[PDB]
């Protein structure tokens, strides 16, 4: 589908509210496999199970290993911009 840019608002006591799978070492993108009900990703409205996360706050995640992506994603705070695509 089309590449989309999606804004998420996270409070400091929260995680993102997603499960991710994938990673470069597995030959697949960082993929959203779950969205937790009521947590920030659900609340933002624009993220869906099956979305690939291409970038977060301008950091490319297309070529990142799984644990690299975890570190990068978990570092982001507050108003967080995602670039995503549903294939």
């Amino acid at each position: 589908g089309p590449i989309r840019k999606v804004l998420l608002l996270k409070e400091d006591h929260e995680g993102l509210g997603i499960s991710i799978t994938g990673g470069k070492e597995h030959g697949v993108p960082i993929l959203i496999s779950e969205i937790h009900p009521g947590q920030p990703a659900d609340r933002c409205g624009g993220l869906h199970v099956g979305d690939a996360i291409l970038a977060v706050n301008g950091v490319n995640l297309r070529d990142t290993k799984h644990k690299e992506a975890v570190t990068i994603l978990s570092q982001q705070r507050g108003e967080i911009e995602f670039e995503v695509v549903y294939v």
């Binding site: 994938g22 597995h26 799984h66």
Partner: peptide, 10 residues
């Protein structure tokens, strides 16, 4: 996709 990739809750 790849079922062999791990999953992290974040």
């Amino acid at each position: 996709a790849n079922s062999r990739a791990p999953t992290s809750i974040i």
